[PDB]
Amino acid sequence: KSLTRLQAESSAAIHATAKWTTENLAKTQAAQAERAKAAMLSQQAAKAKQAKLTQHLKDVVDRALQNNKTRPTVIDLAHQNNQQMAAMAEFIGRQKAIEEARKKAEREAKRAEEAYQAALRAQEEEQRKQAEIERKLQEARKQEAAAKAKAEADRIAAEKAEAEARAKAEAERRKAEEARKALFAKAGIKDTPL
């Protein structure tokens, strides 16, 4: 094969690889946009869960403040009677039990708050990765355009070298035939009808 045809095969193979690279990045972009959308969905669910468990904590706090209204009066501590002691002991038991339930509602609200912050960070990270893939995909498209333009220019150069090779061989063949026939014609030996 001619050097121009061999050069056109080399650049066509490089353009085929540039196409594969761009296509791989385009599929990566589409799969990464789906992961970002999945992370937005998971973040909206953690946001809802945080609001729900915060409301539950608020409801347990209101149960405490309602029970606190029932606090009995025990001021003569040296002369407490059995009914006043039972009233105070039962009030303290109810306040301690509500406090255990409030501590648990608060532990759960805090975990849900932390899970909402983690899902916000995960959404941010999937969007960061998506924007980086998009920058690489733009890079892939620019390299592919350059490879396409080069493969095309090499193919046209190969075609031009063959058109020129053919024109030159025809021009040399006609020049030799005319040179031979001019010797006869210049000596006055002329052509005649068939």
Residue numbers in the entry: 62 to 255
Q: What is the paper's account of this structure, in its own sentences?
A:
Here, we use biochemical, biophysical and structural analyses to show how a bacteriocin exploits TolC, a major outer-membrane antibiotic efflux channel in Gram-negative bacteria, to transport itself across the outer membrane of target cells. Klebicin C (KlebC), a rRNase toxin produced by Klebsiella pneumoniae, binds TolC of a related species (K. quasipneumoniae) with high affinity through an N-terminal, elongated helical hairpin domain common amongst bacteriocins. TolC is one of the most prevalent drug efflux channels in bacteria and is frequently associated with multidrug resistance. Our results indicate that TolC, in addition to its known role in antibiotic export, can function as a protein import channel for bacteriocins.
Crystallisation screens were focused solely on KlebC51-254 since this construct retained TolC-binding activity (similar to KlebC1-271) whilst removing the putative disordered region at the N-terminus. Crystals of selenomethionine-labelled KlebC51-254 were obtained in the P3221 space group. The resulting structure, solved by single-wavelength anomalous diffraction to a resolution of 1.9 Å, revealed a helical hairpin spanning 150 Å. Modelled density spanned Lys62 to Leu255, with residues 64–131 forming helix 1 of the hairpin and helix 2 containing residues 145–248. The lack of density for residues 51–61 suggest that the disorder predicted for the first 50 residues may extend further into the molecule. We explored this possibility with heteronuclear NMR experiments and found that indeed the first 60 residues of KlebC are disordered in solution. In the crystal structure of the KlebC51-254 isolated helical hairpin, residues Asp137 to Gln144 comprise the linker sequence between helix 1 and helix 2. Using disulphide-by-design, two interhelical disulphide bonds were engineered (L86C, L198C and A107C, Y177C) to lock the helical hairpin in the conformation observed in the crystal structure. In their reduced forms, both L86C, L198C KlebC1-254 and A107C, Y177C KlebC1-254 bound TolC, but in their oxidised states neither protein could bind TolC. These experiments indicate that TolC binding requires the helical hairpin to undergo a gross conformational change from that observed in the crystal structure.
